[PDB]
Scaffold this active site. Structure first.
Site, PDB file in Angstrom:
ATOM      1  N   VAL B 168       0.657  -1.415  -0.412  1.00  0.00           N
ATOM      2  CA  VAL B 168       0.231  -0.106  -0.107  1.00  0.00           C
ATOM      3  C   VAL B 168       1.119   1.286   0.233  1.00  0.00           C
ATOM      4  CG1 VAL B 168      -0.653   0.172   2.449  1.00  0.00           C
ATOM      5  CG2 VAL B 168      -1.773   0.627   0.963  1.00  0.00           C
ATOM      6  N   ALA B 219      -2.047  -7.874   1.237  1.00  0.00           N
ATOM      7  CA  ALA B 219      -1.242  -6.505   1.016  1.00  0.00           C
ATOM      8  C   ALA B 219       0.120  -6.007   2.387  1.00  0.00           C
ATOM      9  CB  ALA B 219      -1.546  -5.053   0.012  1.00  0.00           C
ATOM     10  N   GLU B 278      -1.800  12.620   7.994  1.00  0.00           N
ATOM     11  CA  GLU B 278      -1.837  11.213   7.976  1.00  0.00           C
ATOM     12  C   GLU B 278      -2.565  10.390   9.016  1.00  0.00           C
ATOM     13  OE1 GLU B 278       0.219   9.011   6.443  1.00  0.00           O
ATOM     14  OE2 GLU B 278       1.553  10.446   5.116  1.00  0.00           O
TER      15      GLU B 278
END
Lengths: 495, 493
Positions: B168, B219, B278
């Site tokens: 990712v 992932a 984030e």
């Protein structure tokens, strides 16, 4: 307003708004009532009014969860707000601003009546039997049954110049004897000592099912010589109505559900407790407390005994007292020039912490740092009566809403540095009930105090290392309003 | 729930089918507005928004926000998240954790190779590549650019083709056919980049966006170098992911992927990338130079759906996917080590900045240890792992509470962590560099941010507890709890 001053009307009020369930089923004061009320706090259900209690005085009733919260987010605090005259959608912030307002309103003298509803039934001497009441065993680990968990003591100074009202628990000892704590450093203890210095026991009364706003006043710290009864009038803009007791020249609210009368013994004790307490725990060992001799009692017809089944949040200790503490503390901080714009003792922290919202613009003006600000904050806070009761302080900037535990946890986790933001003040005296204190802390008298800083270092210079990426702080005002008003045309309805 | 797990398009119809999808027909703006709505969606915990009408964008192209956000309904709060692991709507933390750990022990199933798939319904080659025609969002006001990839993964293959990798990653939009985003040097994609760089070649690359819900999650598995993510989809949902070959570089991508990009990760070209809000809830102010990703071709389904993550305050996709996945990894690390831990949970509310460890106190007492030794021990074991490297703070509490519920963790912390004894800092254990509270001293030391908070009362190390808990569950006998619950409607509730 009529609810704040009349407990019975307070009850019909909750019923009217659907915040009451009338339990017609026969229930048991041995644990069952408590177990139901406990589930009521936790599920945030209507307050139960228990109509049939097994083997009790016929007509005697019990009200569980008198200030528990509601499941309705919009009206969560309506029960608690009602103890302050406040309406259904009053939140934490509404109630605090109301409380700081009251704290500077003129007290109103209690209106003296010849007569009142609490006088409908009187038991004198030998006719007194407390066991006839639906006296609950509230937790299976309690050291006995508690007559008083939702009332205040009434005592008067020897020369009669001033009155005290103060909340305390009273364990049922026998048909006309109770026992419970009496703190020497407080108005009740101070007044006991005055009667001790006269060689006398202390004339006493306890009001149970007192006006909701009278319970509230009965917790405020005030200078010695000052009477709690006038601050009912400060709270709600109307005086509390009182009548003299049958027995001992004390004044009690006219419409109290049940008044007990007697005296606090000079020397007699009984092993009292233990009880499950506000902090969420039930310690296993009890300690001796003064006897309270009930020489007489009186009650309204079909008397309602309100109770508090203390424990994990939210219960009346967090909702009523936590809220009041947050007001007093907000008032203490602003007064001393601290950049605080809100204080909230999160219910979830069981009154073991209070969170301080900080205007980082005003903080920048102080030209200080974390350790220095933390020490200054601790002294102001812990040096007050309200803040003596909370051992942990969290200092966070005001970009987050400190009445929201989710937001406090975010700040807590992301801002508090392990090396720099943990300020122990182990020489500041403890409130002894704090559950994590150990034997060294209790013998010493201190060790439990702490300030947790979530104020980034650059915030003291008025700066911030990074913007908050939330809806509120990551988008301009014009856009936020657009999304807010258009929300339902987007297809959301109510998110 | 394997049809939703293995097809984004089916996943989307499913959400609609359950009342967990809102179809936005109001014309919206890829500039901030899309993100502002989606941000508000996470926070109010609303149905996922499917955006149909986007200003000045490719017709038929849609956007999906909050792909794995929470729902306000407490009983189905985790349903959207659970579909990614192919779980039922009433799935919660422990259900999903137990599911993950079993999957980590489960054997990979080789991805099924197809010749054709819906991801090939539209192909743009070379100069036809105009990434700007998609509804590419600016997600936060202080972002340094617009982001094409915030909910998808990179595909890179080792030069000899013995294994590939799914990772990712965020890709900022640079121009027509250029993106930029971080390539972690130690991860599988940085390892392979280095492998191609020793051949003086850039790295052939693809990104899958709108990939199978289980492909995105797979992932994030813990895999040793030399092992491919793609087969651990089958580990996850009992069924293999289906895959086709890329149009231009012979890479394997999932067949039903909404949008596939194809190209190469430049050897030495960079653009200033970021900043971006984030996982931690913050948008730091400075951008950082990052590798170029030349997009030489892209293919996409008819009417492609571009999923996005609007990263920031919880709960969003970093917390619900990676956070949930970390807790499970940490539960394994602890149990494989010998620690009396029956659960680990990375509180969403704490933005993956802490993990609350559930301690079995009957099993703890057997250890014959104390706070300081245990703390240090739990710390070397946990922070020494790949999952625990990513979490700066650990909380140790008894398992009388649900470490899953934040209000109980808060109660435990307030009432059990002692200011003088239970704050164990580990200043010399390497930090994960993105923790928001570090300072320059820390970053230059490379450590200083680690902590274990101990909420085990001192007597619990000998097996005792100072006090019982005063709640419905613990202050009353089972028999009486049962009666109260049975008679609940009888009382009149």
């Amino acid at each position: 307003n009529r609810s704040a001053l009349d407990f019975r009307h307070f009850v019909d009020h909750l019923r009217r708004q659907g915040d009451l369930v009338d339990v017609h089923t026969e229930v048991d004061a041995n644990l069952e009532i408590g177990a139901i009320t406990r589930r009521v706090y936790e599920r945030r259900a209507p307050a139960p009014l228990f109509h049939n209690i097994r083997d009790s005085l016929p007509g005697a009733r019990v009200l569980g969860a008198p200030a528990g919260l509601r499941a309705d987010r919009a009206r969560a605090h309506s029960r608690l707000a009602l103890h302050f005259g406040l309406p259904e959608h009053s939140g934490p912030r509404d109630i605090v601003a109301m409380l700081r307002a009251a704290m500077r309103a003129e007290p109103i003298a209690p209106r003296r009546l010849e007569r009142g509803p609490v006088q409908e039934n009187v038991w004198l001497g030998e006719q007194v039997d407390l066991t006839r009441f639906p006296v609950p065993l509230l937790h299976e680990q309690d050291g006995g049954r508690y007559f008083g968990t939702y009332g205040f003591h009434v005592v008067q100074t020897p020369d009669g110049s001033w009155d005290s009202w103060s909340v305390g628990r009273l364990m049922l000892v026998d048909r006309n004897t109770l026992a419970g704590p009496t703190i020497p450093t407080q108005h009740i203890g101070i007044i006991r000592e005055q009667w001790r210095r006269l060689g006398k026991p202390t004339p006493w009364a306890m009001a149970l099912g007192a006006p909701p706003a009278a319970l509230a006043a009965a917790g405020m710290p005030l200078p010695e010589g000052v009477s709690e009864a006038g601050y009912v009038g400060a709270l709600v803009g109307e005086p509390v109505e009182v009548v003299r007791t049958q027995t001992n020249g004390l004044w009690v609210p006219a419409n109290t559900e049940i008044v007990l009368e007697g005296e606090i013994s000079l020397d007699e004790t009984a092993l009292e407790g233990p009880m499950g307490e506000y902090h969420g725990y039930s310690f296993p060992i009890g300690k001796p407390q003064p006897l309270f001799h009930v020489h007489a009692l009186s009650f309204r017809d079909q008397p309602i005994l309100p109770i508090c089944v203390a424990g994990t949040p939210p219960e009346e200790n967090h909702t009523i007292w936590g809220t009041m503490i947050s007001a007093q503390l907000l008032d203490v901080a602003q007064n001393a020039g601290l950049p605080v714009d809100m204080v909230w003792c999160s219910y979830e922290a069981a009154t073991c912490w209070a969170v301080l919202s900080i205007d980082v613009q005003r903080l920048a003006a102080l030209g200080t740092d974390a350790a220095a600000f933390a020490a200054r904050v601790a002294e102001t806070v812990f040096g007050s009566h309200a803040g003596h009761l909370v051992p942990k302080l969290i200092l966070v900037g005001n970009d987050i809403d400190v009445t929201e535990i989710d937001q406090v946890v975010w700040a807590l986790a992301t801002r508090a540095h392990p090396l720099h933001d943990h300020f122990a003040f182990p020489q500041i005296r403890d409130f002894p009930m704090v559950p994590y204190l150990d034997a060294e802390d209790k013998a010493r008298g201190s060790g439990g105090r702490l300030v947790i800083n979530c104020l980034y270092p650059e915030q003291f210079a008025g700066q911030m290392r990074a913007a908050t990426a939330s809806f509120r702080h990551a988008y301009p005002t014009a856009l936020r309003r657009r999304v807010e008003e258009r929300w339902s045309d987007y297809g959301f309805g109510d998110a």
